[PDB]
Design a protein around this ligand. Structure first.
Ligand code: HEM
Ligand SMILES: Clc1cc(Cl)c(Cl)c(Cl)c1Cl
Ligand SMILES: [K+]
Length: 405
């Protein structure tokens, strides 16, 4: 339960928040994490949960810590410490300067140039899944769209057969929202056990897929190793398999209960990109951290070398000191402030792919199924972790209110 309070941690800064099962979860994950920003909670607190660690609660500190890699290393970015110690994905577990060379190579397989070329492909799949669900008048959004849409896109880019999805998704889920069946260490080992032969055969007979590019790539002039390639593909796998999936559910859950907001984008489709950004702020869902490289006094608090600090990317945009009425969705919001795709040298490499997947979804879905709602009685459940998600999302609609395009 509660790890004994270290001697250096002030008793009054203790706030036992449990990132894997927050107290106010029933009200929605974002709302549950938002408790850390209530009137009497400090900018920086210590929780004795999950082994004990700090938690920056305001955007100001969060952005600062992410900028200062020398004090806040990505060496151990996962909580609990055991997971963080086993975590060695590239470039995520590295700090500049060494991080850069790998980021450049990763950026080459999921970067903008690659995204633009994938546009038509993305639209075709979006249109396909929706046009098929349309006459049915109902769907289980998580498995009928949220998962297949972005996952099939990722497997395509990676050159991996879709039959492996159930196994891979389960492993990634265990790394973000473990059900207890296995440690982060175990899930990582299994992911690597899966990648090894594939990488080997790709360096051997090089193709045009993401895996082949990484496996046969160069890092600042020199050949990447088999192990480095494995570590990088793990970073790409974790990213394009769990995050967009869940975010689409948070956004659709909201749209399903917001006819006014839907009407907005229906009438003025050009507001979709901006709406996408506001949704990214309001339904931010990622929260990982850093490890102190040395004793350091941060905002009046004595942090110790080895201490772990959670810097919830989610909280920045929900901070009222960054956005007035943060919990309100406003597609017209003048200054959408957030760190949803991270902050600093680790800014999400898949953000461009993610935005495209989000916008295309909204545009292609509202254009075919403009009127829809959440199936009655359904108590929509959220789940918290490194990456928060939506358990299930039953939607319903009158086929007569739809249109084929
Ligand atoms: C809504 C969608 C997404 C969100 C909110 C998101 C969020 C994030 C966050 C917050 C980080 C920073 C972790 C840190 O600083 O420790 C990150 C890193 C990363 N993400 Fe994304 N992610 C998304 C989608 C994707 C996709 C689709 C991919 C493609 C595989 C991806 C690939 C990566 C990679 C490779 C990194 C590591 C970059 C580095 O460490 O330099 N992400 N992402
Ligand atoms: Cl999408 C995504 C990809 C990677 Cl590689 C990491 Cl480390 C995190 Cl934390 C998130 Cl959220
Ligand atoms: K580590």
């Amino acid at each position: 339960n509660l790890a004994p309070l270290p001697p250096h941690v002030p008793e009054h800064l203790v706030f036992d928040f449990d990132m894997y099962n927050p107290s106010n979860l029933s009200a929605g994950v974002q709302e549950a994490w938002a408790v850390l920003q209530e009137s009497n909670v400090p900018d920086l607190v210590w929780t004795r949960c999950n082994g004990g660690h700090w938690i920056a609660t305001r955007g100001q500190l969060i952005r600062e810590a992410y900028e200062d890699y020398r004090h806040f290393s990505s060496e151990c970015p996962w909580i609990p410490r055991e997971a963080g110690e086993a975590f060695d994905f590239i470039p995520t577990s590295m700090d500049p300067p060494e991080q850069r060379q790998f980021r450049a190579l990763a950026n080459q397989v999921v970067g903008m140039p690659v995204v633009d070329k994938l546009e038509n492909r993305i639209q075709e799949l979006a249109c396909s899944l929706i046009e098929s669900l349309r006459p049915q008048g109902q769907c289980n959004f998580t498995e009928d769209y949220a998962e297949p849409f972005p996952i099939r896109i990722f497997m395509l880019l990676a050159g991996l057969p879709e039959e492996d999805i159930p196994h891979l998704k389960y492993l990634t889920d265990q790394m973000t929202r473990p059900d207890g069946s296995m440690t982060f260490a175990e899930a990582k080992e299994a992911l690597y056990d899966y990648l090894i032969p594939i990488i080997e055969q790709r360096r051997q007979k090089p193709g045009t897929d993401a895996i082949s590019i990484v496996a046969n790539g160069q890092v600042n002039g020199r050949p990447i190793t088999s192990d480095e390639a494995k570590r990088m593909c793990g970073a790409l796998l974790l990213g394009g398999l769990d995050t967009v999936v869940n975010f689409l559910s948070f956004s659709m859950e909201f749209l399903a209960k917001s006819p006014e907001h839907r009407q907005e984008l229906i009438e003025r489709p050009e507001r979709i990109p901006a709406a996408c950004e506001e949704l990214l702020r309001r339904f931010s869902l990622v929260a990982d951290g850093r490890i102190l490289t040395s004793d350091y006094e941060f905002h009046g608090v004595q942090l110790k070398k080895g201490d772990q600090i959670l810097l919830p990317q989610m909280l920045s945009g929900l901070d009222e000191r960054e956005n007035a009425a943060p919990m309100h969705v406003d597609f017209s919001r003048q200054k959408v402030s957030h760190t949803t795709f991270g902050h600093g040298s680790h800014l999400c490499l898949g953000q461009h792919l993610a935005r495209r997947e989000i916008i295309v979804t909204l545009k292609e879905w509202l254009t075919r199924i403009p009127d829809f709602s959440i199936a009655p009685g359904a108590q929509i459940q959220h789940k918290s972790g490194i990456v928060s998600g939506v358990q299930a999302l039953p939607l319903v609609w009158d086929p007569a209110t739809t249109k084929a395009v």
